[PDB]
Write a protein that binds this DNA or RNA. Structure first.
Ligand SMILES: [Mg+2]
Ligand SMILES: [Mg+2]
Ligand SMILES: [Mg+2]
Ligand SMILES: [Mg+2]
Ligand SMILES: [Mg+2]
Ligand SMILES: [Mg+2]
Ligand SMILES: [Mg+2]
Ligand SMILES: [Mg+2]
Ligand SMILES: [Mg+2]
Ligand SMILES: [Mg+2]
Ligand SMILES: [Mg+2]
Ligand SMILES: [Zn+2]
Lengths: 166, 292, 148, 108, 279, 153, 231
RNA sequence: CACCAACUUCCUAAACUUAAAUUGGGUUAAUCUAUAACUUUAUAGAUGCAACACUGUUAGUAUGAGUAACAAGAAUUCCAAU
């Protein structure tokens, strides 16, 4: 057990100078001991990464997976504790900066078998962490153009040196 | 030089905005209530002369920001980015509303304004391009028409198909840039200074100032381009997805000064049209449509 | 360990020998105990050797700070800013004297694999070989099979 | 058949993070014009649909009380009337279901 | 729970590295750290360079205006090095200019000034200053010392050296340290010229020489995406210089660069600067 | 290998498939709006309409009466089918039933659902889809084209 | 832990009978004012003056003053403003450094939770500009035994609150604002170690609205189930 | 009419001449005790004194694998219901 994602929500930064850029807000929320697999939960967490909170609260609602409702709840708690206790002006000015699922404490039980034999069953739990950062979703990755691809090849050749000699 | 004209107008626009903002000291909270069907009864406390209808959408959800084009302040259409002034009621109008009359006109004027910007900067510096006005035509007209006067040296030259294609590429470039429209209310005295060179613009400014009891005028800036606006416009250029300058027709009764009517079509991202439907509408726009 | 470690090229601090040679060792600090068997060898070093070393190298500020201590420690500061500390626990005067002389002679440069034994800023005097060297030209510069 | 070697996390991370195994994003989500809740384009709005079904249950409950038996379905046409409404001449000879509440806006 | 205190102690230091290295503290001037006496370190600085110094004069050089103001405010809640800085900079500029002119008299005055400014720039001066321990002994209100303040102290040291030992010894210090940096560096890295071909024509006219003729000496894979061309400028059918380039224009432009060096004698095969003269 | 096989495979076999549809149909013929998994509701839709065809034939026809018995488990609904459902649909020749897809089930089974009804029912109207009005931007432009073409025609 | 136990006894079920505390809890202050002095309309217009009015009102508070003499014998109405002034300025300064220990001594147990609770994970910059007018003692009341003293304070102040991230909410970086308020100072007459501290501030109805917060706020609308409808 | 080729040999600095059961020798990691030292050290006295390997023992966690396998007749007016 180690609950550090809970403490990070309490960090206090020093006041800014009159012309410093306005620091974007960060929120740290999670839920523990969820009756779900961490491997199954990752697909839901991976999906929402890099999206807004009104664009991640829509994709989740129409997913059949059980975890979709669980994540949606902690994406609404995060969306409320940001506006009330972290000074976020607009509900629609957030985006999921990070989101991942972690292993929890499990329980060991006996799964019976057919010849007086058995195997060890584990009832699986997990945790799920999310960070929300105030600001529109960073623009997506732009694929390298053909010109950019060609430039790297030339740059690679330009770096060539005469090896193993003065 | 035309570059000088843009700079001075731009500077004048900035000064007018700066005084208006400086003119308003402190923050005074104003009550505005949501009157729309869905999410009814919400009440926003906003900053007077600073808050915008876009901010009201931001509180509610991202859907309103993405799908809202105009807002009805106390039964009057107001630009989404135009700052609020006093306590009122706010209703957001999407394209797909049952009564989109106001939305259609806002989009209509908007597209023809972007058309005007393309034309002036499309020509070569050697020739002279002056913008007279665009007549208000019903959407049923089948295209939006901007009238542009041209230098006498061009009276014998009519743009070819390649020239028409070039304009759309510039228009699409403006759309891709995604430049928000800037909404400013300007008194006639300042407005005349910004457009003193253009006699037709001066005359249009006089008409607008005369209509209202005061000398208030509506000025819209699309990036560098600055022009008077008949009505509230779309918040952003990216709202347009399909764009096309159908054709340009010389006005027959233009003995004193030759004027060419520049007619085009555009459809927003919301109401996209299939390829076949787009072509038929494009063909209709090529027909010259008069103003009733 | 070569692939498992960093490397660099042969280098100096400020072109040490181009003009005047400047001693790189800047400061040596030695902490000792009045009553401790381990620091006995170092106590002999301070009695006799330290005075000779200080005069021989007058660009090395030497600090001796006897304190109640368990391990005698020598800290070497170079001009480039690099620090180096070596434990002198239970070392005789002969070992310390030899050890200190290594510190004075070395420079602050990192002790890691040196890629090349030599360094030159002007390796070529007659011009670096390029493919067109030793290639004869043709009248009017006609490339092979060009009719002109 | 049993594994001949343990499979490394790198190989496992290649199989379970493949594009074929990820959740494909949905592009058909919209906003219901009336209530504003989210809906898929080819599907009805649950929020609006729930109102209709809730009214349907109340109407059906009222019908059950009147009939009072399993095999009591009336051949004649059914009709539902709300408070403040009286049957018209064209509605004569039609079973009437009485509801205390006012006529809902969606109901016509 | 095993026996002993030592295993914990070795690990406590392991914890020390983890915390310090992951979250390093802000830099602190060497004065605040242990084993610091100002006078002794100042003496070693002169001895290290082998130059006898006036200790009182050297002390004033390290003093800065910013440090004095901060100290006075703290006292409420000792002479600056400005004069030395003016003398140090003035002599260094004259000394640097004199050295370059003798070595390259043909080089235009504009070229010499750029080299003098470069060798007296913050990047060159600060890098040498830091490695000479000037910053450690420097007295400045704000640490790490800002480059403009550190550059001032370096010139202040030269001014102090000049007064104590005279011009001849001060001249050696500039050569020994400042002039060395230009080793390896070619002229056009230190001095930036964007119109070499245009300047080449001007120089040839000054020499009463006709304008050059550019011709394609060698060609390689022109149509490909990796073409090499050798462009050589010809005067009176004589090759003044040659240049390699990716394109003819770049080869032509570079070929001008080669010629300008020739005229100014900055070809890398020039006689190496004589840093080793006893006098 | 099931090309042209219109029927589905439901229940425990062929006969069971017929008996599950008889229950949804009887519920529909009784309530006029019934819910089921999209697959099973769609399977019945063909059977639901054909009852009206037999109902249109009339009470006197022996075949219609016999069929209306096998396909109506409760026997208080045959009088209703013939005397209210059939008269309603006499004008129409098709499209007796309206089928729409209700969101997926919130049961942990998460099965696709649909609501099937009989047109003209007394129950509250379903939230049907609405096409955009003729006044909308795209719609208005087309109308202008229609007018122009109509004049040209 | 009790937090874990509270969940246990709610899930498991339990009869938790409350108990009569063997040792009574100790109260160093009592929430509220025994007799709140209704502020007089036009107190700002008096730009002596109130002090004369206080003399007429002193007869109402004369009984309370006598009780203070019996247990203190050093309390002076004339000299209290200066002492009270010291407490007010000193207390608000602690906020700057968030010195909880200093506040506890200066303010009462009733006052402390109000000032500090809403300023957790928040930096508050507060200074004292020159006071516009001298402070006077408005009214004093003693009930039990607790004695409460009300002091009129009109002083110019500067306050600027910041978020966790250092962004500015409320107040102004540095601008003098004139504030008139009534502060209640009380001491425990019985306790030997008691002292006068800041308990509560009386707010008048004629007080002007305070500075509005910078950020805009949405007052949400009713949340309605499918059954319900808006009106 | 030769070149390349292995620490063979030479050369700057050094070194002093050949798989493994067994056999001789010099040191060292950890801890306790004596006497000290006092950021973790010294000389002695001691011993449950050092583990990449016994299908070793205990605990924890992987892989196979989110795989094999597991379960609730329908509609409604609906879970002590028709
Ligand atoms: Mg068994
Ligand atoms: Mg297992
Ligand atoms: Mg098939
Ligand atoms: Mg099929
Ligand atoms: Mg050998
Ligand atoms: Mg052992
Ligand atoms: Mg082991
Ligand atoms: Mg083992
Ligand atoms: Mg596994
Ligand atoms: Mg498998
Ligand atoms: Mg299976
Ligand atoms: Zn809806």
């Amino acid at each position: 057990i180690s609950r550090k994602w809970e403490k990070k929500n309490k960090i206090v930064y020093p006041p800014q100078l009159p012309g410093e850029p306005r620091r974007p807000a960060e929120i740290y929320h999670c839920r523990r001991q969820i009756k779900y697999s961490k491997d199954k939960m990752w697909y839901l967490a991976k999906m929402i990464r890099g999206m807004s909170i009104d664009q991640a609260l829509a994709q989740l609602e129409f997913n059949d997976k059980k975890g979709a409702q669980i994540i949606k709840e902690v994406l609404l708690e995060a969306q409320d504790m940001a506006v009330r206790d972290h000074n976020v002006e607009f509900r629609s000015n957030l985006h999921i900066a990070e989101s991942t699922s972690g292993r929890g404490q499990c329980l060991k039980r006996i799964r019976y078998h057919g010849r007086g034999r058995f195997g060890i069953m584990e009832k699986v739990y997990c945790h799920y962490f999310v960070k929300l950062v105030e600001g529109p979703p960073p623009p997506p990755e732009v694929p390298k153009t053909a010109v950019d691809h060609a430039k790297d090849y030339i740059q690679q050749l330009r770096s060539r040196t005469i090896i193993h000699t003065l | 030089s035309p570059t000088e004209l843009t700079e001075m107008r731009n500077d004048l626009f900035n000064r007018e905005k700066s005084r208006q903002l400086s003119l308003t000291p402190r923050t005074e909270k104003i009550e505005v209530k949501h009157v729309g069907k869905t999410d009814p009864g919400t009440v926003f406390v906003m900053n007077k002369n600073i808050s915008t209808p876009y901010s009201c959408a931001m509180h509610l959800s991202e859907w309103y920001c993405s799908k809202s084009i105009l807002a009805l302040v106390d039964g009057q259409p107001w630009d989404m980015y135009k700052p609020l002034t006093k306590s009122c009621e706010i209703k957001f109008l999407t394209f797909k509303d049952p009564d989109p009359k106001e939305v259609n006109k806002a989009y209509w004027r908007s597209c023809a304004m972007m058309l005007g910007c393309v034309i002036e900067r499309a020509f070569k510096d050697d020739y002279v391009v002056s913008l007279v006005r665009a007549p208000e035509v019903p959407v049923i007209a089948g295209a939006f028409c901007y009238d542009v006067t041209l230098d006498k040296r061009l009276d014998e030259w009519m743009p070819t198909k390649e020239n028409l294609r070039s304009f759309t590429k510039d228009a699409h470039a403006l759309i891709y840039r995604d430049l928000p429209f800037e909404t400013l209310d300007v008194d006639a005295r300042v407005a005349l200074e910004i457009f003193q060179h253009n006699k037709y613009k001066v005359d249009f400014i006089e008409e607008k100032a005369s209509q209202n009891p005061e000398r208030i005028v509506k000025l819209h800036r699309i990036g560098d381009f600055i022009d008077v606006s008949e009505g509230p416009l779309i918040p952003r250029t990216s709202v347009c997805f399909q764009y096309e300058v159908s054709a340009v027709h010389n006005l027959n009764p233009s003995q004193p000064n030759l004027i060419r009517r520049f007619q085009g079509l555009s459809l927003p991202t919301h109401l996209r049209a299939q390829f076949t439907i787009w072509d038929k509408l494009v063909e209709r726009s090529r027909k010259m449509v008069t103003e009733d | 360990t070569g692939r498992g470690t960093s490397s660099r090229f042969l280098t100096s601090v400020l072109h040490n020998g181009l003009g005047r040679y400047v001693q790189q060792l800047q400061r040596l600090s030695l902490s000792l105990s009045r009553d401790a068997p381990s620091s006995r060898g170092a106590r002999e070093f301070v009695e006799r050797e330290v005075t000779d070393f200080a005069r021989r190298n007058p660009g090395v500020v030497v600090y001796v700070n006897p304190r109640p201590c368990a391990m005698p420690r020598i800290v070497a500061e170079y001009l480039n800013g690099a620090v180096r500390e070596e434990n002198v626990n239970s070392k005789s005067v002969e070992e310390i004297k030899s050890l200190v002389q290594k510190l004075a002679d070395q420079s602050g440069l990192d002790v890691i694999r040196i890629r090349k034994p030599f360094h030159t800023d002007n390796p070529s005097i007659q011009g670096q070989w390029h493919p067109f060297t030793n290639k004869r030209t043709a009248l009017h510069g006609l490339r092979p099979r060009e009719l002109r | 058949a049993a594994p001949k070697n343990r499979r490394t996390i790198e190989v496992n991370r290649c199989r379970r993070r493949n594009p074929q195994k990820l959740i494909k994003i949905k592009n058909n989500i919209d906003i219901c014009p009336e209530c504003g809740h989210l809906k898929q384009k080819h599907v009805l709005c649950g929020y609006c649909y729930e109102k209709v079904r809730q009214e349907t249950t109340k109407i059906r409950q009222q019908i059950g009380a009147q009939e009072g038996g399993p095999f009591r379905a009336p051949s004649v046409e059914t009709m539902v009337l709300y408070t403040g409404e009286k049957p018209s001449e064209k509605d004569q000879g039609k079973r009437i279901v009485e509801r205390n509440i006012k006529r809902p806006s969606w109901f016509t | 729970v095993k026996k002993g205190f030592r295993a914990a102690f070795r690990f406590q230091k392991e914890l020390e590295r983890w915390r310090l290295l992951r979250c390093p503290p802000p830099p602190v001037r060497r004065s605040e750290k242990p084993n610091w006496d100002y006078h002794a370190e100042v003496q070693a600085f002169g001895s290290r360079l082998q130059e006898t110094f006036s200790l009182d004069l050297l002390k004033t050089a390290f003093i800065n205006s910013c440090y004095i103001k901060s100290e006075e405010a703290k006292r409420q809640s000792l002479k600056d090095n400005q004069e030395l800085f003016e003398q140090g900079l003035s002599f260094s500029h004259r000394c640097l200019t004199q050295f370059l002119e003798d070595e390259f008299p043909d080089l235009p005055a504009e070229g010499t000034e750029s080299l003098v400014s470069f060798l007296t720039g913050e990047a060159v001066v600060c890098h040498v200053a830091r490695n000479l321990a000037v910053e450690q002994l420097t007295l400045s209100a704000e640490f790490p010392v800002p480059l403009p303040v550190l550059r001032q102290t370096f010139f202040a040291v030269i001014g102090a050296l000049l007064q104590s030992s005279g011009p001849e010894r001060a001249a050696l210090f500039i050569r020994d340290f400042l002039i060395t940096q230009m080793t390896g560096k070619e002229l056009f890295e230190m001095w930036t010229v964007v119109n070499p071909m245009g300047l080449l024509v001007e120089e040839l006219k000054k020499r009463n020489i006709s304008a050059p003729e550019s011709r394609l000496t060698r060609q390689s894979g022109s149509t490909t995406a990796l073409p090499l061309y050798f462009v050589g400028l010809y005067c009176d059918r004589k090759l003044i210089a040659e240049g390699p380039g990716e394109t003819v224009l770049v080869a032509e432009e570079e070929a001008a660069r080669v010629a300008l060096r020739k005229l100014y004698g900055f070809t890398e095969n020039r006689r190496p600067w004589d840093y080793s003269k006893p006098k | 290998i099931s090309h042209g096989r219109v029927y589905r495979r439901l229940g425990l076999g062929p006969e069971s498939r017929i008996h599950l549809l008889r229950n949804l149909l009887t519920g529909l013929v009784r309530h006029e709006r019934i819910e089921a998994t999209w697959a099973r509701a769609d399977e019945m839709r063909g059977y639901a309409e054909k009852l009206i065809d037999y109902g249109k034939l009339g009470d006197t026809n022996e075949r219609a009466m016999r069929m209306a018995d096998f396909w109506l488990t409760e026997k208080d609904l045959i009088p209703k089918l013939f005397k209210v459902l059939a008269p309603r649909f006499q004008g129409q020749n098709g499209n007796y039933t309206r089928m729409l897809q209700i969101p997926n089930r919130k049961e942990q089974d998460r099965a696709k659902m649909a609501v099937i009804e009989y047109k003209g029912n007394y129950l509250p109207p379903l939230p049907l889809p609405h096409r955009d009005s003729n006044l909308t931007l795209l719609n208005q432009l087309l109308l202008g084209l229609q007018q122009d073409l109509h004049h040209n025609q | 832990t009790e937090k874990e136990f509270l969940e246990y006894a709610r899930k498991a079920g339990l009869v938790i009978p409350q108990e009569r505390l063997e040792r009574p809890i100790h109260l160093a202050c009592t929430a509220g004012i025994f007799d709140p002095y209704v502020p007089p309309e036009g107190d700002a217009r008096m730009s002596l003056t109130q002090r004369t009015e206080r003399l007429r009102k002193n007869a109402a508070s004369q009984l309370a003053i006598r009780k203070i003499r019996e247990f203190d014998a050093n309390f002076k109405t004339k000299d209290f403003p200066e002492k009270a002034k010291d407490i007010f300025i000193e207390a608000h300064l602690c906020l700057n450094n968030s010195d909880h220990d200093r506040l506890h001594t200066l303010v009462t147990e009733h006052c402390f939770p109000d000032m500090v609770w809403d300023l957790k994970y928040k930096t508050v910059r507060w200074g004292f500009v020159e006071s516009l007018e001298p402070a006077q003692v408005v009214h004093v009341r003693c009930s039990g035994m607790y004695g409460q003293v009300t002091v009129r304070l009109h002083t110019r102040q500067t306050l600027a609150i910041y978020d966790r991230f250092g962004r500015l909410m409320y107040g102004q970086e540095d601008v003098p604002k004139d504030v008139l308020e009534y502060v209640v100072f009380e001491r425990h007459l019985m306790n030997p170690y008691g002292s006068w501290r800041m308990h509560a501030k009386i707010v008048p109805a004629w007080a002007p609205p305070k500075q509005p917060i910078l950020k805009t706020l949405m007052i949400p609308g009713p949340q309605l189930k499918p059954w319900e409808e808006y009106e």
